[PDB]
């Protein structure tokens, strides 16, 4: 299967490491490789240098250096034992007695820092988790126009999230500038006087403007001394507190001058310098030195605001939604922030501990309490919104999840607090954030995916690469630039024709400040690297993207994530070229480090002899259960003695074929309605797919049980379960666990557990029964683990962890835990959801035999039948072109790589189809067969429809039909041909994770809630279906009063009513009349608890007791 | 003392109670300032209030001190060893009379109850109480099988004589009361204990014979 590549755009640079956004940021944060003396003031090192030294105010706790030890357990051990993959963090601290002049130095153990795996995901509590980058407003100074009053602007000073209050500066109608902090508004003149500014300085600096400077001059504040002005400012900010100079200056310093409490940030400082044209010494609004306050940013901000109000040419407002004004916090920044919070708590504990208790005899180890830091870190890595449970259905799933950017999370936007402004695709999203890919629904526009070529810079601003164009020739120099820098140049398009390096087109389509323009080659300053940089990883994997509507390409890209690995997965016929890169960068496959020869090949491990001679053994991950239940296995693709070059493939990862991403099957697809089984996106498949095991996956389910200690006695996991026959215990071994390899069905026992019964006398009927049968009641009862309905399979693994095992930290009171991994081989069935890369999705509605599917004149039946009516409404024409190219490849025996927006076009597909028809019909001519009568009738009908040129021979008409992508398709039932030619091709169809087997649920009676006594919800808990308000409204509209009453009382919460109804049904009688629900009783009791007398009356207004006298004294 | 399970104002009020006690017990003859003596009582009252009111399930002060000492020892061993200590090391460091089992039980006791309204998920539409079944009230299946067992037992007892059935119901609590002893039933019927036992055994044997010949009552035994 030779690969033919289309396209004329030559990329000067390759795709950057797709996981670098997660990996490089955490490497910068930890700095575990750089020696401590060479560490820069970033990340947790910056946090240490910020919080430390701690001063009692003569005891000083200073920090010298920190180191990270080797992790106690490897990744596999942490996953198996449900541990957290982390490295021990120790800090070196010194205690200095200022009065005494003695130093005590020792290394204190601060705790454990979770480590990142090579793929970019953490292992928290044995579960793979991914930290999602958060997009937020970049700190700095912005100038937004006031919407309430036209012609006026308001200045906003934004620090880092939870690192200071937002400052507002506004021009009041009176002409006096107002500063707003923490919802409190006051005259800015007071705080400006606190910074030691005189009338002459303000007159000389801000006087070259309108009446704003005159309004800024209030002799009441200017005549006031800076100390009295500071006291008045403190009184205005915090009323009631006594005016004290020390407290006032401390509060002001902590509000606008304390680096530990106020942090504008590196990005904020850079933005302030870029906008206001100043050089901030630090990252604070004001500087407290020599016992006095010095201005840093307030005066330049006020000057810029006054100039913008006046209307100077060089100053303009700032766009809040501009992607240059919006930055990204990766895993490193969030982890550093949480570490800083924990370290601040630790410093507070040290300070409150170092001033009390044996001050002379102190050591840094005793003072330092590391519990708050570890608590904050574990809270961030477990219970944070941005720390999401890893989606690893396929390597592409994890790859996208690591590259996701979420506007939600702690300190960010909210799902229902977000308007259209944040959800729209700004003009600066070009080449930095994927426009099409986003989760549709309530989270559309709030979660996005990073572009393919985009990379987050040091400050957190997304950059995109552009080729420098000078003198009309495009050079190989590539500049990674942000949106604010991008807005200053005219950037051409990657599809502009080039005569080598010189631009050939006289009229070049370019972008100026985000708007499309037509310019000359001389005016071109930058060029796009490639069309791929605009779209993310998923969208770059959709061939013929230019022919798909954005709303449907969104669905296609999203569903590419949900495709499950298949035991016979094969790469698509029509590719875009990123499959190999996705597989390589997802770290799912196995590749040789350098040149060498493979010495041993096995299903479990591969031993390779490199050129230097060293033996390297790579274990093969075999049938490991992913987070989503899919089976992730690596299959060797080499043989003993085979020589491999550096970077060559050694073992295919999950959902991969020879290093190419294989999320589905290449199946013969015919586009035609079929007996209504294609109705409303439904898909018809052939039984031939099941015969040769296509769309067949492996799913592993984990069932966990725990034997604990109980006051009644310790629960024992044993094979001897009381009142059970030998048939039920056939599969259980001597230890009470199901033997490995046994087939389990719903209701079968996986592990046997007996629990001591609560000491309570039995009901008299049971006692009489026991006396009649002479069977003494045992002291234990069956509490074993059984397969839930709708599940089962083959037991493939049993893990038994016991208390006292090395590294197994069981919860207190739990003797042991048993986990059973049961694997089932799922085949395609009716109700399973299939899809394709172009967003065409549907559930399999019929599985026809091979003899019923339409077949080609050569006898080849089609495998999948698609409804054509899904094309015109969804406007996803790319699937048609993929079908044509797949037909050409199927009859030519080759695969194609057509990159998005630069690849296969209509003439190329037509000539490929011409070659395919040439070989296809030459084979028939050589076999000695002419033209079918049915083919002749179809050709006549087609020429009546204008599809083929009249007067040509049947061979020429058939060739024309093939060039149109249509073939004469016969009917498998009647044998007569389909009256019109049918588009038949080879299309790549994925099997999605949504399967009817895991979604079907039913329930008659089961668990009920605690308070309302209503049935629970969810298939896992065996709950009922929610009959919400809208269903009740529908029942009322039908007027089904009795059905609604039943669904409200008999089937939901009428305890006596439901018990009597069940007893009547099992006795063959009709259910009785329902009674008052328990929910209304809860309502009445809660209203009474609110001191409201709710009484139910009758026709004569007499009270009616709905509690049957149980609540009456 | 803030952040130890009680709000700031509650700590202030308990310290006020301790201050009142200190004023009651303060002596100025010793020439010590009031702050020195009052601090002891204030911190004692605050600590007692934290021990007695910072947990939903109250724990005695001695057990609270034991838990605090265990936590301090565990923290010291954790910082000394650079890892989380096992129960054996903690028990060894605590002192005599402590083993791994006692440490595990103390840690189990020190487990604060979990709130029933803690949300799970990005959306605030789920709670713990939605996943905890009610295992107190009988299920409809349990009530149905209890009624079926009662009906089958009543039908089976019809084969017995009038006196034997009454004796068996009295002796097995079928009259909703506690199982009457042999002497009680005998006095009720004016018969001696031995004859009551004999007739009860004979009726039980007859019921066993009927069940063997019918096998319409075995399924309810479980």
């Amino acid at each position: 299967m030779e690969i033919k590549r289309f396209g004329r755009i030559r990329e000067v640079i390759p795709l950057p490491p797709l996981t670098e956004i997660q990996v490089e940021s955490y490497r910068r944060a930890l700095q575990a490789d750089v020696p401590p003396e060479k560490r820069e003031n970033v990340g947790i090192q910056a946090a240490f240098r910020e919080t430390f030294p701690i001063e009692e105010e003569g005891l000083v706790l200073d920090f010298l250096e920190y180191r990270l030890g080797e992790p106690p357990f490897p990744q596999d051990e942490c996953r198996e034992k449900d541990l957290t993959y982390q490295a021990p963090l120790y800090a070196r601290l010194q205690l200095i007695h200022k009065d005494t002049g003695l130093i005590k130095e020792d290394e204190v153990f601060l705790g454990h820092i979770p480590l990142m795996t090579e793929d970019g995901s953490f292992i928290i509590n044995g579960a793979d988790r991914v930290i999602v980058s958060q997009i937020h407003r970049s700190p700095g100074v912005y100038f937004t126009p006031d919407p309430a009053r036209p012609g006026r602007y308001i200045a906003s000073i934004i620090p880092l999230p939870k690192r200071g209050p937002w400052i507002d500066l506004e021009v009041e109608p009176n002409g006096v500038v107002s500063m707003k902090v923490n919802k409190r508004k006051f005259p800015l003149v007071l705080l400006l006087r606190v910074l030691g500014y005189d009338q002459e300085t303000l007159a000389r600096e801000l006087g070259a403007y309108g009446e704003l400077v005159q309004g800024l001059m209030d002799e009441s504040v200017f005549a006031m001394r800076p100390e009295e002005a500071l006291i008045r400012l403190f009184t205005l900010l915090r009323p009631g507190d006594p005016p004290k100079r020390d407290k006032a200056v401390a509060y002001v310093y902590g509000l606008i001058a304390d680096p530990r409490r106020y942090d504008l940030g590196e990005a904020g400082r850079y933005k302030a310098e870029e906008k206001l044209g100043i050089r901030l010494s630090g990252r604070t609004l004001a500087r407290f030195e020599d016992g006095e306050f010095k201005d840093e940013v307030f005066l330049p901000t006020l000057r810029y605001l006054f100039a913008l109000t006046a209307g100077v040419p060089g100053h303009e407002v700032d766009d809040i939604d501009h992607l240059g004004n919006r930055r990204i916090r990766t895993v490193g920044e969030l982890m550093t922030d949480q570490f800083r919070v924990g370290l601040a708590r630790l410093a507070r504990g040290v300070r409150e501990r170092m001033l009390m208790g044996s001050e002379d005899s102190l050591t840094p180890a005793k003072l330092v309490n590391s519990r708050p830091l570890e608590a904050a870190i574990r809270e961030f890595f477990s219970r944070s919104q941005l720390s999401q449970f890893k989606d690893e259905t396929n390597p592409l799933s994890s790859l996208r999840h690591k590259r996701r950017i979420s506007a939600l999370g702690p300190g960010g936007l909210t799902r229902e607090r977000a308007g259209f402004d944040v959800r729209d695709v700004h003009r600066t999203h070009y080449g930095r954030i994927c426009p099409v890919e986003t989760p549709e629904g309530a989270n559309i526009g709030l979660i996005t995916s990073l572009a393919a070529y985009a990379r987050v810079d040091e400050l957190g601003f997304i950059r995109t690469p552009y080729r420098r164009v000078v003198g009309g020739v495009v050079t190989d120099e590539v500049v990674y630039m942000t949106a604010t820098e991008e807005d200053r140049y005219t950037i051409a398009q990657a599809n502009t024709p080039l005569e080598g390096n010189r631009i050939a087109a006289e009229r070049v389509v370019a972008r100026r400040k985000g708007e499309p323009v037509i310019v000359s080659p001389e005016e071109v300053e930058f060029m796009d690297v490639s069309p791929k940089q605009v779209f993310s990883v998923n969208t770059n994997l959709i061939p013929f993207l230019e022919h798909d509507d954005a709303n449907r390409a969104l669905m296609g890209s999203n569903m590419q994530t949900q495709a499950v690995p298949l035991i016979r997965a094969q790469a698509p016929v029509v590719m875009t070229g990123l499959e190999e890169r996705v597989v390589r960068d997802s770290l799912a496959a196995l590749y040789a480090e350098e040149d060498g020869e493979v010495a041993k090949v096995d299903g479990n491990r591969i031993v390779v002899r490199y050129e230097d001679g060293r033996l390297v053994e790579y274990p093969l991950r075999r049938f490991y259960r992913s987070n989503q239940g899919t089976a992730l296995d690596q299959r060797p693709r080499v043989v003993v003695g085979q020589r491999v070059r550096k970077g060559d493939l050694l073992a295919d990862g999950p959902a991969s074929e020879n290093g190419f991403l294989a999320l589905g099957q290449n199946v013969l697809v015919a586009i035609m309605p079929f007996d209504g089984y294609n109705f409303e996106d439904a898909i018809v498949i052939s039984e031939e797919l099941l015969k040769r095991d296509f769309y067949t996956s492996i799913h592993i389910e984990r069932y966990e049980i725990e034997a604990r200690d109980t006051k009644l006695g310790p629960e024992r996991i044993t094979r001897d379960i009381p009142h059970l026959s030998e048939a039920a215990l056939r599969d259980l071994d001597e230890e009470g666990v199901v033997r490995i390899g046994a087939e389990v069905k719903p209701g079968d026992i996986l592990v046997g557990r007996t629990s001591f019964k609560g000491e309570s006398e039995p009901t008299p009927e049971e006692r009489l029964l026991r006396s009649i049968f002479g069977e003494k009641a045992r002291d234990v009862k069956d509490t074993s683990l059984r397969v839930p309905p709708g599940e089962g399979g083959i037991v493939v693994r049993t893990v038994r962890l016991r208390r006292g095992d090395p590294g197994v930290e069981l919860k207190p009171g739990v003797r042991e835990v048993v986990r059973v991994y049961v694997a089932q081989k799922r085949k395609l069935q009716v109700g399973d959801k299939l899809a394709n890369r172009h967003g065409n999705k549907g559930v399999v509605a019929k599985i026809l035999p091979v003899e019923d599917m339409p077949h080609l004149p050569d006898g080849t039946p089609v495998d999948v039948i698609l409804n054509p009516l899904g094309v015109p409404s969804r406007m996803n024409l790319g699937q048609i072109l993929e079908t044509h190219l797949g037909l050409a490849g199927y009859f030519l025996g080759q695969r194609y790589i057509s990159p998005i927006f630069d690849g296969a076009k209509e003439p190329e597909i037509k000539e490929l189809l011409a070659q395919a028809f040439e070989v296809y019909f030459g084979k028939r001519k050589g076999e000695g067969f002419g033209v079918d009568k049915r083919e002749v009738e179809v050709l006549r009908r087609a020429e009546k429809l204008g599809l083929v040129t009249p007067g040509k021979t049947p061979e020429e008409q058939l060739k024309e039909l093939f060039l149109q992508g249509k073939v004469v398709l016969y009917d498998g039932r009647t044998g007569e041909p389909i009256e019109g030619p049918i588009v038949v091709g080879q299309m790549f169809i994925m099997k999605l994770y949504h399967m009817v087997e895991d979604k079907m649920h039913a329930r008659s009676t089961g668990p009920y809630s605690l308070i309302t006594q209503q049935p629970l919800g969810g298939k896992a808990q065996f709950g009922g279906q929610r009959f919400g308000e809208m269903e009740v409204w529908a029942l009322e509209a039908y007027g089904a009063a009795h059905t609604l009453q039943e669904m409200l009382t008999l089937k939901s919460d009428d305890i006596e009513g439901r018990n009597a109804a069940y007893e009547a049904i099992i006795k063959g009688e009709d259910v009785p009349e329902p009674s008052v629900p328990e929910s209304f009783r809860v309502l009445v009791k809660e209203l009474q608890a609110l001191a409201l007398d709710v009484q139910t009356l009758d026709e004569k207004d007499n009270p009616v007791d709905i509690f049957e006298g149980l609540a009456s004294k | 003392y803030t952040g130890r399970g009680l709000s700031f104002l509650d700590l202030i009020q308990e310290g006020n109670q301790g201050l009142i006690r200190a004023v009651e017990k303060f002596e100025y003859k010793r020439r010590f300032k009031f702050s020195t003596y009052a601090t002891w009582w204030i911190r004692q009252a605050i600590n007692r209030a934290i021990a007695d009111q910072a947990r939903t399930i109250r724990i005695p002060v001695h057990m609270v001190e034991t838990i605090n000492k265990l936590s301090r020892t565990a923290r010291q061993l954790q910082q000394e060893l650079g890892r989380e200590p096992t129960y054996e090391e903690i028990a060894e460091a605590m002192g005599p009379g402590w083993d791994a089992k006692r440490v595990e039980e103390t840690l189990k006791i020190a487990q604060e109850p979990v709130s029933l309204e803690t949300p799970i998920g990005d959306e605030k539409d789920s709670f713990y109480g939605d996943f905890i079944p009610d295992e107190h009230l009988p299920s409809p299946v349990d009530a149905a099988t209890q009624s079926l067992l009662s009906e089958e037992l009543e039908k089976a007892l019809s084969k017995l004589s009038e006196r034997e059935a009454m004796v068996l119901k009295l002796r097995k609590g079928l009259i909703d009361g506690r199982e009457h002893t042999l002497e009680e039933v005998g006095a009720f019927f004016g018969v001696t204990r031995e004859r009551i036992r004999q007739i009860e055994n004979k009726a039980l044997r007859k019921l066993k014979y009927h069940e063997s010949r019918t096998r319409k009552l075995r399924d309810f035994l479980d």
Binding site: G240, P242 | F8, L9, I12
Partner: peptide, 14 residues
């Protein structure tokens, strides 16, 4: 007024 601690501190400051 809205903060009970503030009101209590003001009361004890008298």
């Amino acid at each position: 007024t809205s903060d009970p601690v503030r009101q209590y501190l003001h009361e004890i400051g008298q």
